[PDB]
Symmetry: C6
Subunit: 229 residues, 6 copies
Amino acid sequence: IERGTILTQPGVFGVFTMFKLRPDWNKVPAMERKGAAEEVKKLIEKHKDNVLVDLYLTRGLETNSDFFFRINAYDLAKAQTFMREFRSTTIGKNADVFETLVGVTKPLNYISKDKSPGLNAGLSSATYSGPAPRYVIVIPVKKNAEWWNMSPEERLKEMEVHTTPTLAYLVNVKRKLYHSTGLDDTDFITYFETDDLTAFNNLMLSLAQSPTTLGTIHSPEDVIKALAD
Amino acid sequence: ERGTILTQPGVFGVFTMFKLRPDWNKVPAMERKGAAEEVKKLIEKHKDNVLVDLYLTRGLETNSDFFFRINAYDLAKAQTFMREFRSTTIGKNADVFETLVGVTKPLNYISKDKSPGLNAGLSSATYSGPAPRYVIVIPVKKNAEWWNMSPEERLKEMEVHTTPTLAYLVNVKRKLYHSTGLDDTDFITYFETDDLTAFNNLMLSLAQSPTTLGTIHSPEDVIKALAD
Amino acid sequence: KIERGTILTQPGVFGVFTMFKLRPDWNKVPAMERKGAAEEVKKLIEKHKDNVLVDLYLTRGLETNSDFFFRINAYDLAKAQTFMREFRSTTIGKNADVFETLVGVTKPLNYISKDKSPGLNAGLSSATYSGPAPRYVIVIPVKKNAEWWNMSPEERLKEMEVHTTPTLAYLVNVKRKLYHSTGLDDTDFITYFETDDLTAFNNLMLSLAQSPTTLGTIHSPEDVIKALAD
Amino acid sequence: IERGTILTQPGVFGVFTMFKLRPDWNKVPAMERKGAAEEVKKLIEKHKDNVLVDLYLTRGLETNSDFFFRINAYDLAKAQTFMREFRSTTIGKNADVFETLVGVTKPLNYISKDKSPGLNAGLSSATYSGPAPRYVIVIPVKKNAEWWNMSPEERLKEMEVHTTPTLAYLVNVKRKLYHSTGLDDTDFITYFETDDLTAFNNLMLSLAQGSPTTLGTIHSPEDVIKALAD
Amino acid sequence: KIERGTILTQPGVFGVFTMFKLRPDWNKVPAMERKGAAEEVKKLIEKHKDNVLVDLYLTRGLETNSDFFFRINAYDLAKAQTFMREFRSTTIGKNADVFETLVGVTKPLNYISKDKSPGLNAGLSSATYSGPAPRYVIVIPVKKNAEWWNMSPEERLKEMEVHTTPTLAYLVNVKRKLYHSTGLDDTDFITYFETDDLTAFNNLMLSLAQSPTTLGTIHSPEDVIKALAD
Amino acid sequence: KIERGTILTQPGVFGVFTMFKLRPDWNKVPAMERKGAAEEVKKLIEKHKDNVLVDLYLTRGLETNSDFFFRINAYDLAKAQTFMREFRSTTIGKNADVFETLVGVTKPLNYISKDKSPGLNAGLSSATYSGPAPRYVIVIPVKKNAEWWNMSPEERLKEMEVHTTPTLAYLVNVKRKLYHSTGLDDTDFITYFETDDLTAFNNLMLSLAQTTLGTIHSPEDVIKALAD
Ligand code: HEM
Ligand code: HEM
Ligand code: HEM
Ligand code: HEM
Ligand code: HEM
Ligand code: HEM
């Protein structure tokens, strides 16, 4: 598993699990809590060849969660095994699952070279340029009957409308699409990274013209350390 | 056995989704490590009564950690197995999230008689992948507009349903149970695949009912995974 | 005197249906105390042999929201109440929550009578259950809407004739019993079915299609309690 | 306070409180439980010049309650005091309030001698002729904006439609109307007693051609509590 | 300093209404601790003699969702907050949950003023309460919909004249006080009533017919607490 | 480094609003531990002097669903998050549930700018707050519907001019601050008001028609009020 490769390929599974710490986490012995970070660190190293692990901090920014994982894997069952084993961890045993989202990466359906070459070239010509992102946004999306009724040609035109004002934001915002229909009770999981939350608000407003999860990006052991305190 | 019962009409399916109680972690480790054997013995005890499938959802689902599919010629035998499972060490430490009851039936619409072309397509398509690693279960309830329609109208719609889905039969196994009158839904749809991208594409094909996604294992392995 | 064949066949008979869900602390009841629960219930039913008819059904393993339910039939509703109240004082009764209680009363035919609908009435009499002893029970409470009650008696009779036409055939393999609940409970009817053939029942419901369903199995009361004590 | 007088006068307050026994009632020492009936009996006697007290048994017939009181009083504050004091009682401390309904008795608004003499005469010529009633029914009723929009003349005609088929039932169903608008979150509390629940089902169907129904049995207060101590 | 007859009669006065329900563990508070609760509240009110006007009302025995409620009037809302916060630290305050909190301010007449509606305004002044001291309180919060706010001032005035016309008659029997809440709370108005005659109040509401209601009884604060300690 | 008068005045500033309700077990915390809670919070705010601006408000006695709330302003949202998470590890923080969390960012004028609406923009500049320091705070989150977002920019501008016209008068008595939330939270705006005159605020809301209410104190005073 190489981070730069797996995050770039079709057919990759994404499993997103949002956790809320149970009230009795405060009652776990401080020493046992202080060992939780290293336990998680070792679990991630144990699964180094199995899955890519991202862990984000939402505590202080979200009412319904304290942290969430994004697991990427070529084999969904490996993602499942990691998540299952995390739940047997000291902190895992003291956290409720708020939300679990399963999706899979796919090739471009609409804005491809063949179907929409102008906007496709814009998609490739745009490259992220600021500092390493501090922030993550996850938004699941379910499309309605009206969307699915539409012809492929009509949906392509709508996706060209989607893509036109959003290309400018790629210098500032990283995006990643996972597809969920049949795998979960949603159609897509949209995933964003940014250092510039004002740009992200402008992006969303450009699009306006679900449950949002906002968190911060850290090493997994730092996230756990922040939750042990 | 397995190959026969999963292939006949008049066969009952009982799907029960379980969520481990928080006090499962508090069960002594030795008692938890004996849970798998206990379930294995119960299944062997009912070898001549029911077919048992047990699946792992923990790590992929918020609302369940495992679920059973029981197939039986006699519904009461499926009930007996499920009740006895719930008296098991792990069973006593799990809440029932969902219970679905349905029965297998002959083809209503895409039969040789009513729809010979698509019926032939249904028979000529054969699963060609490796042993499936994933299971999907989706209960379906149809609305009054569906039931209002004529048999001919419903047939036309089922022909629309079948047309784009035949392609996926090489890649995805499907099994239909009928539930009207037996439960608070109309159908239980059941799928196995090794290729979840294919399954996603299949559902999208149809788009153009809460979903349970789990993983296929031997029963003792599922319990072993939950004991840890 | 309660004769099963007589009481289940008369008008003015009260039905009380109570669905129970075992509390989590039932597993914590000493195993010997649990093993004595069946006999306690058996004796209670015996005690009330002249007061009420008792049916007890097993729903555990088939239903999320209940483990068992009673159907009590009685000439005197107060007697059904007394039995149910005394059941809740039993070992198993003390360890079970009430999920649902339905009260209804048996009545003469309102629509498909000799007088109003003689053809279909004759079909109702000529149809006889011919299967083995039923293994399965289905209970469905029904509330009718404003539109139904708005309709004329003549319009409601025509609809009941529509209801009866495709269902007569199913009487060879499905037993039915109607209770009327309006004013006695928050529903209008309790419908009650017995069958050995759940494929026939699914077909029956589909024939009709063209509130919540309780499915259970029929056993002696002590067998149901024994099954729950394990 | 005279039962026959207070139940027959305008300006009389009704307070209905439905109670559900808490799970820890079973854990109350059996002798403490067996003393509960006498405690309630003495409270009722202490208030014999303050309020009329009725207590009814719903356990075994209702999911959401085990018993309920109807308190009648000339003075509402006295009904409040009794109920408060009941809640301090051994059984009162082990019971949750499911529902509280407050209403007041009033003169005839519609079917009066002046406004509807024919039906008014029928109302007075009908007399309850059954045995002492064993069953109570309570149904709260809230009317909608359409009702209140209607003219007094239109509402009177509707009330004449209400009364026409129901007069027949007065030989075996007792009725009492309380008015609740402004006093509670409903418009009326309807209260019925009968020995014949078949007739009551027929009555409600006659009418059919916000409102949860409470069905219970009529007993002495001490017998209701004794039944609940068991 | 604060005079009851003055502050209850001025614009710009804040009302804070807080409805409390006793926690189950109130019964478990030592009896002597509970019997000292009344004096503790009495002293708190005395402490804030110059800060707020305090009314306390008993709803237990009449309401499912509350046992008592306060109405605090004050020139300074922050002082009403301070009292309520300090009450919540009392023995009984520590053993009660807040069910509802309503905040409003008193204002001059918007509609039925001398300038806008002189006839009805004169009727408003010429009517005075003539009963015995009121024993009963009613509180009803009111939220008006978009249709109301869309209407012109002239249209709203005409509606308020419709409101006032039949209600003037009831001012001999019913005290009224209006608080305005828009922006301060999630409702538009807090309406407050006192009466000794609940039949008149029912008649009044029916006159108007042609949110949730809280009914309680008026007492000294110490008597209300004493009533809850028992 | 952070200056109150500066950070409250700039675009690109993040606001984090978190409403807390004290757990029933707060009364069971030893009185001396409760009495030290105020200084603990004071020290935490001091430690983050250069990272965030902290406002703490008292809602106990005025709200059913909360006892206190924070408004954190910061150039860096992550620093607001750090303060809030460290607050939650405090003695009082450990004994309070989060009822509500609102995230937003400050932005330049979108509608009532000099360019787009010069007359009303001038009125915005000319109406200033007078009178005593505000005693009261009001926070109202706002989500706009699909009808709003499908309107043209011109149509939305006209609406915002309708919004601004009767509200200018209230700026002598009410301070206002807008935060933008779309994409950062499940709402579109966080509106924030301070006033000493709640009658004026009532009239303002009524003018618009044609909610969290709290009181402003130093952070240690709010905590001291809650320790009692
Ligand atoms: C950062 C700027 C963005 C760019 C450049 C962008 C571009 C695109 C492109 C090119 C696709 C087509 C994928 C394909 O061909 O299969 C797509 C799909 C999609 N986008 Fe974005 N997007 C952006 C931001 C967003 C945001 C903020 C959302 C809101 C959650 C969003 C929601 C979606 C969804 C739900 C789809 C799948 C649509 C479908 O296949 O039916 N996007 N986007
Ligand atoms: C794997 C590819 C699939 C194929 C080849 C297929 C084919 C069929 C056929 C031939 C029938 C008619 C059975 C009869 O005549 O009685 C049917 C029924 C049905 N299918 Fe599928 N199907 C597929 C996937 C799916 C999926 C993904 C769903 C979504 C949950 C679904 C939902 C249903 C339902 C609810 C019925 C019962 C319809 C009714 O009787 O009204 N199917 N399918
Ligand atoms: C087993 C086959 C069935 C037969 C032969 C049958 C026949 C009848 C007849 C003759 C009546 C009218 C009795 C009268 O005149 O008073 C009736 C009533 C009724 N049936 Fe069935 N039925 C069958 C199955 C069902 C099923 C499966 C349901 C669904 C729950 C159902 C629901 C009802 C209801 C709610 C009524 C009350 C009608 C009313 O008085 O408004 N029936 N049935
Ligand atoms: C037992 C046979 C019944 C008779 C003889 C009867 C008769 C009457 C009469 C004469 C009135 C008008 C009282 C007046 O003028 O102020 C009335 C009112 C009313 N009745 Fe009945 N009734 C009967 C049963 C029922 C039943 C079963 C209900 C259903 C719950 C019911 C609901 C009501 C309600 C809600 C009102 C108040 C109507 C209003 O003033 O808006 N009654 N009844
Ligand atoms: C006791 C007899 C009553 C009289 C004489 C009366 C009279 C009035 C008057 C004169 C006003 C106008 C205040 C102004 O100009 O600012 C008013 C407002 C109002 N009244 Fe009453 N009222 C009575 C009872 C009631 C009742 C029973 C309710 C129902 C809860 C009620 C609800 C309201 C409300 C919500 C307003 C504010 C309306 C608004 O400003 O939009 N009133 N009343
Ligand atoms: C105190 C007097 C007020 C004045 C002078 C005022 C003025 C303004 C102005 C000029 C804008 C446009 C900002 C821009 O152009 O980007 C605005 C936006 C907004 N105001 Fe107010 N306002 C006041 C009170 C209120 C109140 C009481 C509320 C109710 C909660 C409110 C809700 C909003 C909202 C939600 C927006 C965002 C609108 C959008 O961009 O779609 N305002 N206000």
